[PDB]
Amino acid sequence: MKNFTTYLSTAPVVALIWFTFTAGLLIEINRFFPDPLVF
Amino acid sequence: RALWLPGGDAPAHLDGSLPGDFGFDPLGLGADPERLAWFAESERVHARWAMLAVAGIAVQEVVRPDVFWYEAALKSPPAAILGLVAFELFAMHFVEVRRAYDFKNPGSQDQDPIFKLPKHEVGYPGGIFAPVIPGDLAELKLKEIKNGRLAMLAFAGFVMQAQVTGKGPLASLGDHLSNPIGTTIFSKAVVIPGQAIVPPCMIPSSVIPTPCFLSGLWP
Amino acid sequence: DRQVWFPGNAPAPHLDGSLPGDFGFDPLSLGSDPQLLKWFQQAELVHGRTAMTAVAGILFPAVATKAGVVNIPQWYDAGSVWVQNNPNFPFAALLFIQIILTGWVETKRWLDFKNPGSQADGSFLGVTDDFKGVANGYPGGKLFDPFGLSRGSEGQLQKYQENEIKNGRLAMVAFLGFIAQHAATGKGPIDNLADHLANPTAVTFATNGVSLPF
Amino acid sequence: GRRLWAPGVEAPSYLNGELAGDYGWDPLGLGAKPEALKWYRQAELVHARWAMLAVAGILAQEIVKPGVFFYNAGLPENLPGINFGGPEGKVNLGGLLAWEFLLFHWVEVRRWQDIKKKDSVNQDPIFKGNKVPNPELGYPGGIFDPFGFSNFKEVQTKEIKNGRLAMVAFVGFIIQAQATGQGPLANLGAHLANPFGNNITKNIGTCAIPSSVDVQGITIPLTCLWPGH
Amino acid sequence: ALPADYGFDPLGLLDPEGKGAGFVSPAWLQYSEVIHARWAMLGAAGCIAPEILATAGVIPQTPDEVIWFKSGVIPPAGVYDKYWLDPYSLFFIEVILVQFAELRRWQDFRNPGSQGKQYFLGLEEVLKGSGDPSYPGGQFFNLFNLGKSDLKELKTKELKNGRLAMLAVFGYGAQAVITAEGPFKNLTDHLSDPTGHNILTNF
Numbered sequence: 032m033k034n035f036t037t038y039l040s041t042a043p044v045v046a047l048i049w050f051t052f053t054a055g056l057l058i059e060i061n062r063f064f065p066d067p068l069v070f
Numbered sequence: 071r072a073l074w075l076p077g078g079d080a081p082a083h084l085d086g087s088l089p090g091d092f093g094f095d096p097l098g099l100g101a102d103p104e105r106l107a108w109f110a111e112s113e114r115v116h117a118r119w120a121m122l123a124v125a126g127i128a129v130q131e132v133v134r135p136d137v138f139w140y141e142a143a144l145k146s147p148p149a150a151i152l153g154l155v156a157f158e159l160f161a162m163h164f165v166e167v168r169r170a171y172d173f174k175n176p177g178s179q180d181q182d183p184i185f186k187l188p189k190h191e192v193g194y195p196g197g198i199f200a201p202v203i204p205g206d207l208a209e210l211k212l213k214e215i216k217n218g219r220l221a222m223l224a225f226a227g228f229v230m231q232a233q234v235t236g237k238g239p240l241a242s243l244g245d246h247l248s249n250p251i252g253t254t255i256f257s258k259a260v261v262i263p264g265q266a267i268v269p270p271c272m273i274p275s276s277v278i279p280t281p282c283f284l285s286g287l288w289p
Numbered sequence: 290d291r292q293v294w295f296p297g298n299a300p301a302p303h304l305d306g307s308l309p310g311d312f313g314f315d316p317l318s319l320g321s322d323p324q325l326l327k328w329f330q331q332a333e334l335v336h337g338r339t340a341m342t343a344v345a346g347i348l349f350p351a352v353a354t355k356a357g358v359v360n361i362p363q364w365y366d367a368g369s370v371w372v373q374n375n376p377n378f379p380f381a382a383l384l385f386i387q388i389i390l391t392g393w394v395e396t397k398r399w400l401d402f403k404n405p406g407s408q409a410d411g412s413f414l415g416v417t418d419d420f421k422g423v424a425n426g427y428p429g430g431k432l433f434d435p436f437g438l439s440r441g442s443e444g445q446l447q448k449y450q451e452n453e454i455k456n457g458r459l460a461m462v463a464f465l466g467f468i469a470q471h472a473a474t475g476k477g478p479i480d481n482l483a484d485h486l487a488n489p490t491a492v493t494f495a496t497n498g499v500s501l502p503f
Numbered sequence: 504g505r506r507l508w509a510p511g512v513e514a515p516s517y518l519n520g521e522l523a524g525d526y527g528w529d530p531l532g533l534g535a536k537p538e539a540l541k542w543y544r545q546a547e548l549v550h551a552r553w554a555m556l557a558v559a560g561i562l563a564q565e566i567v568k569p570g571v572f573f574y575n576a577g578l579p580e581n582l583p584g585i586n587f588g589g590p591e592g593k594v595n596l597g598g599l600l601a602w603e604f605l606l607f608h609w610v611e612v613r614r615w616q617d618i619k620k621k622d623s624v625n626q627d628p629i630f631k632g633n634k635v636p637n638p639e640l641g642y643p644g645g646i647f648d649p650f651g652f653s654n655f656k657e658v659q660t661k662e663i664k665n666g667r668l669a670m671v672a673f674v675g676f677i678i679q680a681q682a683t684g685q686g687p688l689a690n691l692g693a694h695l696a697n698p699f700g701n702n703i704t705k706n707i708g709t710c711a712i713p714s715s716v717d718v719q720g721i722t723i724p725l726t727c728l729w730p731g732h
Numbered sequence: 733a734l735p736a737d738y739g740f741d742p743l744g745l746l747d748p749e750g751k752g753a754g755f756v757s758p759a760w761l762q763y764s765e766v767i768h769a770r771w772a773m774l775g776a777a778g779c780i781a782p783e784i785l786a787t788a789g790v791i792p793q794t795p796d797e798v799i800w801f802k803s804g805v806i807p808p809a810g811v812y813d814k815y816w817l818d819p820y821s822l823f824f825i826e827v828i829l830v831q832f833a834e835l836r837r838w839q840d841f842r843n844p845g846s847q848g849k850q851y852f853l854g855l856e857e858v859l860k861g862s863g864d865p866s867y868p869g870g871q872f873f874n875l876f877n878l879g880k881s882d883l884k885e886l887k888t889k890e891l892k893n894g895r896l897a898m899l900a901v902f903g904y905g906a907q908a909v910i911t912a913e914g915p916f917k918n919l920t921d922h923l924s925d926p927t928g929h930n931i932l933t934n935f
């Protein structure tokens with residue numbers, strides 16, 4: 032499990048997880064609050 | 071020592087010092103010493119309270135046969151009920167904290183706080199509480215705890231018989247003596263796979279909510 | 290050694306038999322790291338105890354409803370019925386209360402996991418010994434174990450730990466069954482049991498209509 | 504054992520003829536452990552004795568009352584006419600269950616304590632003078648052996664062999680009653696009347712017992728021991 | 733050395749060198765021949781016994797409905813009317829019970845003797861095997877203690893009857909595809925008119 036979590040901590044896996052989180056957050060914000068142009 | 075199951079083994083934490091000890095603790099509830107002492111005090115007060123309750127319910131059934139003991143608070147001799155609750159709470163609070171600090175600090179609650187009590191055992195007051203002793207100490211302790219446990223079982227029977235019959239205890243005994251084959255709980259309640267016959271409780275749902283005790287799990 | 294989940298297969302080497310319910314079952318080796326294993330032990334205990342409470346609170350009201358004494362709604366409808374019957378209690382207020390209360394108790398449990406016995410300092414209303422904890426996932430003390438069934442003897446404690454973990458795993462599997470049976474039949478679990486008891490050769494997963502969509 | 508259940512086979516090492524009726528028969532190895540073997544010996548003893556009483560009671564019930572099915576003996580209209588108290592005297596079956604439940608809870612818990620610890624409940628609980636000898640497990644004696652008939656091993660062998668025969672016969676009784684709808688002696692008479700025209704090949708496909716019966720307001724579901732129609 | 737060893741391995745599949753791992757090892761292949769043989773004997777007896785007993789009137793079911801491929805195994809070819817349980821619930825039970833039997837047998841193959849250690853309601857006494865996976869024996873699997881001196885001859889007879897049964901089950905399948913009748917129906921048509929009922933007339 033230690034070796035597996037080290038693999039999950041390699042740069043592309045962390046990049047995949049973080050960018051999936053960020054893209055999903057942006058997508059769900061735009062789903063819940065459609066068409067934001069201004070604050 | 072006489073055991074609740076003869077030919078069996080008593081648990082190690084029940085040595086036999088307490089009165090009415092027959093090595094009955096399959097759950098291990100008294101396997102802690104301070105818990106055993108607290109539970110001994112609790113069993114004593116439960117035994118005495120159920121003893122007085124069984125006697126009082128039997129007398130009330132004998133003396134006033136027109137009053138259901140379950141609904142005996144409707145017929146008690148309208149805002150004055152709150153004051154009686156206050157008096158009962160005050161007196162009960164005083165005597166209970168006296169007993170509780172007798173338990174917590176033995177001998178500290180052994181003196182009259184207005185104008186004295188002899189040295190005694192925790193849970194066995196003595197003094198003015200014990201003016202006459204027609205017997206020995208251990209023997210009468212065994213009688214007290216045995217009669218108390220019988221009265222606790224009897225009060226549970228009184229409550230649940232009142233729920234399933236709507237009548238008093240001696241009326242229920244008379245109904246059992248009239249028809250011994252068709253008045254037992256086995257006679258009216260049957261559960262088999264696919265069909266359950268649950269007797270109704272004749273006590274109403276509310277008057278103040280008055281629920282039948284776990285009536286949905288009755289057999 | 291001990292009894293294992295797959296007889297003839299050696300147990301998972303990181304499982305040594307000390308934990309309750311150790312049948313050597315870890316085919317994915319999820320408990321290889323000991324600290325992660327302690328975390329997963331607390332996870333399993335919290336899941337199992339929650340499952341046992343929930344399965345009791347589904348089964349006993351559904352048994353009482355089946356008897357006809359009461360009319361408690363089935364578990365998959367109870368939130369809707371409660372909300373329809375409680376218009377002065379909004380859903381968000383109930384959720385906020387639940388979140389803050391569970392947050393308090395779960396943060397205390399979390400901080401005890403990070404620092405064992407650190408909630409014993411008396412900061413919460415003077416409680417010291419009752420928050421020290423006996424072992425990982427087993428708090429004990431006079432508050433969580435007021436009848437003292439963990440402080441009697443060692444073998445009694447191991448027996449009760451075995452009872453707890455096995456009933457908890459059974460209740461988790463039972464809740465999975467509750468979900469699957471409600472999705473397949475649209476009824477409650479006691480309704481399912483009664484339908485199976487009335488006609489067992491006809492009332493099976495094969496005849497509910499969704500387990501076999503042919 | 505010595506004479507084995509089949510020619511050429513071997514007895515297990517834990518079955519060497521110590522117990523009565525030892526034929527070296529344990530294909531599944533269930534009695535390999537001594538505690539399990541002792542428990543199954545007690546179970547076999549009580550099973551054999553209940554089957555003995557069952558066979559002798561079914562057979563004698565057909566002689567005295569041939570018109571009442573032993574399978575249907577549990578219905579209230581098939582009982583003997585006796586006064587059970589109440590307003591009419593009719594049976595309830597609730598108190599009928601209750602008496603047997605309490606008495607057998609007492610006597611079987613006494614027997615179970617005997618099983619768990621040998622010679623531990625030999626002593627009479629109320630009138631302490633009475634004492635049961637109990638030479639071996641499952642053989643209490645004393646009040647249970649008034650005539651003193653205990654060669655102990657030979658009569659033990661007689662008991663266990665006749666008991667195993669009684670269990671086999673009771674299974675035959677139940678399957679014959681389910682397949683034919685008649686008592687065992689009627690089955691014997693029917694086999695004697697038309698042997699080739701009335702045998703197991705003419706009755707094994709039918710379950711004559713109804714799928715459900717109603718017993719004063721509660722409906723007991725019933726089933727045969729095999730999927731007959 | 734091996735029972736029923738005719739030296740017939742034209743694809744050299746029982747060669748031991750290089751075939752160490754996997755299922756092409758000699759031990760697995762002899763074991764699999766034995767398992768196939770015993771299952772085939774059960775199948776070859778069982779795929780024609782209901783038809784024979786129905787034709788002779790021993791069982792009351794009609795001979796058409798107890799034909800092996802019309803009794804529920806292939807519902808496009810027919811379903812038997814109303815067993816005590818529906819075939820899919822029966823298959824569920826079959827999966828559970830047969831998985832128990834087969835996984836315990838497999839654990840004896842990979843770890844010989846291991847099925848006699850863990851508690852199995854006392855049944856582990858007779859499940860230790862013999863160290864030979866094809867021939868466990870013991871107090872149940874050889875409960876009559878046969879083959880005291882002719883165990884190799886009995887192994888040869890078992891394998892010979894199993895190979896014959898394997899060929900017979902293949903014949904049952906081929907004849908079912910070609911004729912759409914039971915194997916006993918085929919045998920009786922060949923017996924009643926041998927020139928007018930055979931593979932040349934069925935084609």
Ligand code: CLA
Nearest residue numbers: 773774775777778779781782785791793798799803804812
């Ligand atoms: C791989 C072997 C195999 C398989 C899969 C089948 C499959 C089938 N057979 Mg064949 N069969 C076989 C081998 C097989 N057979 C062999 C070798 C023979 C020659 C003896 C037969 C002779 C045969 C006949 C004569 C019949 C079948 C029938 C059937 C069908 C119904 C089976 C059934 O009802 O189960 C019934 C289940 C059991 C018999 C076992 C139940 C055991 C219970 C659960 C426990 C009992 C415990 C209890 C204590 C036992 C005490 C009894 C006592 C006497 C000892 C099914 C298609 C029937 C038919 O064709 O379809 C309608 C039918 O009439 N088979």
Ligand SMILES: CC1=C[C@H](O)CC(C)(C)[C@H]1/C=C/C(C)=C/C=C/C(C)=C/C=C/C=C(C)/C=C/C=C(C)/C=C/C1=C(C)C[C@H](O)CC1(C)C
Nearest residue numbers: 741742743744745768771772775778779800805898901902
């Ligand atoms: C050796 C050699 C060598 C070289 O080297 C190579 C080569 C050449 C390759 C080889 C050859 C070979 C051979 C030919 C193989 C084949 C086979 C067989 C056929 C199998 C089977 C096998 C077969 C078997 C399993 C079987 C079994 C059967 C079964 C049980 C059945 C069952 C049935 C029953 C009864 C009845 C019902 O109704 C249904 C069913 C359910 C359907």
